[PDB]
């Protein structure tokens, strides 16, 4: 039967189309990845953009998951192929593949902003900064016990958050610093109008994983699929294809 | 009931303490020792540490040996060691999210005129090899990359990493050792400080906590690994066993 694949519109992972029908509406890293995984695992699939346009978090009172994690937990989709960050709270409710891409939280600034590091952000007030409202980065700052980061969190929760990455980029370009993951950051660094740059090293190191509902029969297949693709050099080729082979700066 | 943890004597992951007077898991110190203790603490089980019988990591008479074998054939309940996550291993056992990153790298005696793998593949005066049962040797065996099929075609193997290191140190630069960057970088800061890593890594892969396929332990050890990483325990531990003990 057709596997329902949940995913999110996020460049260059999944991108737009009005005249097309199907998965063919979309292009990108996770699109090609979906196709390869499907090729090696031998199933048919339908790509579907996560309903609330979010990655996934749990509301602390209502205790319900949103975003792609929610659509996995509540049986609305059979698999998530996306820049979905492997985190503890998520592993608590769903299954993750071995990571298929490395990344870390990093700072994006408008070219010319006098910022060198996260500590620089934590020591000042003139430049605002925030993260994605539902997502692993915000959870990182919320739960962080590091002085600089607890300080930044203390600022942020009381101040700066955006609903989508595009809103964060737009907010930076029209200003404000944006805290976002290095992969998406570096991708935008090579995008017109070429007015943003990454500053400082990454704040942490984690990975993107393929996600299935906890206990799904697909976990092993998608997991040997990811490992196969990695060892065959397919993943490096895909990143090269969508990041650097299309750099506009 | 007691969980049997299979592991391998490999510095700084699992080592004999300065042990004859001791009994138990207390016989050992090292990265994977601390890691095991934390994993057990967060998963709430008791465990007995056991050194893999044939001292091997795992390869496939079609029978698995080493820690992979001891998992497949029910000799241990979990492997906590520098055991590399690979496709062929995933085919037969389960792996946690990786708790450490690493890549294949070249170890040479200080003064050897070698910069990269291509240089090794292009010459004959300096011999080179890998661990006999292990993921590196498999990497070269299965590599479809020209240089690496060339090196494999050439390839000199050792039974333990210590034999490879000793071979490097006693070969007067006529032998290079192909081994994982973590272990390389570790030996790099160890007396007699006569070895160095050359070139970048040949690949990028990981070490994982392993369980027999379908074990109820996979999930627990996997949330434990994710917690430990996120709480900074892993970075602290690597700092502890690698760099806080650097002799150069
Ligand atoms: N990849 C993140 C979303 C992006 C971000 O938070 O910066 C997640 O899985 O939650
Ligand atoms: N970590 C490797 C052994 C060391 C090596 O092959 O260099 C493995 O799990 O097979
Ligand atoms: Zn449209
Ligand atoms: Zn393929
Ligand atoms: Zn001893
Ligand atoms: Zn602890």
Residue numbers in the entry:
A (entry chain B): 393 to 408, 412 to 506, 555, 566, 632 to 677, 681 to 696, 700 to 773
B (entry chain A): 393 to 410, 412 to 453, 457 to 506, 555, 566, 632 to 674, 681 to 773
Q: Any passages from the paper?
A:
In order to incorporate an additional electrostatic interaction across the D1-D1 interface, we used a Thr765 to Lys mutation to introduce a charged tether onto residues forming the opposing electronegative pocket (for additional rationale). Alone, this mutation had little functional effect, but coupled with the K759M mutation (K759M/T765K), current decay slowed several fold, and the additional mutation N768T (creating K759M/T765K/N768T, or MKT) yielded nondecaying current responses. In contrast, crystals of the GluA2 K759M/T765K LBD were successfully grown in the presence of zinc, and a dataset was collected from a single crystal at 2.9 Å resolution. Three protomers were present in the asymmetric unit, of which chains A and B formed a canonical dimer, and the third, C, formed a dimer with its symmetry-related counterpart. In each dimer (A:B and C:C′) electron density was visible for both the mutant Met and Lys residues, and the latter residue was spanning the dimer interface as predicted. Electrostatic interactions were formed between the amine group on residue 765 (i.e., T765K) and the sidechain carboxyl group of Asp511, as well as the backbone oxygen atom of Ile510. Overall, these structural and functional data support the premise that the Lys tether is not a permanent feature of the T765K mutant series.
AMPA-type (AMPAR) ionotropic glutamate receptors (iGluRs) are composed of pore-forming GluA1–GluA4 subunits (Dingledine et al., 1999) that coassemble with a variety of auxiliary proteins, including the transmembrane AMPAR receptor regulatory protein (TARP) and cornichon (CNIH) families (Jackson and Nicoll, 2011, Schwenk et al., 2009, Tomita et al., 2003), as well as CKAMP44 (von Engelhardt et al., 2010) and SynDIG1 (Kalashnikova et al., 2010), among others (Haering et al., 2014). Each pore-forming subunit possesses four principal domains, with the extracellular amino-terminal domain (ATD) controlling assembly and trafficking (Gan et al., 2015, Greger et al., 2007) and the ligand-binding domain (LBD) providing a bilobed agonist-binding pocket (Dawe et al., 2015). A network of electrostatic interactions at the apex of the AMPAR ligand-binding domain (LBD) is essential for gating by pore-forming subunits, whereas a conserved motif on the lower, D2 lobe of the LBD prolongs channel activity when auxiliary subunits are present.
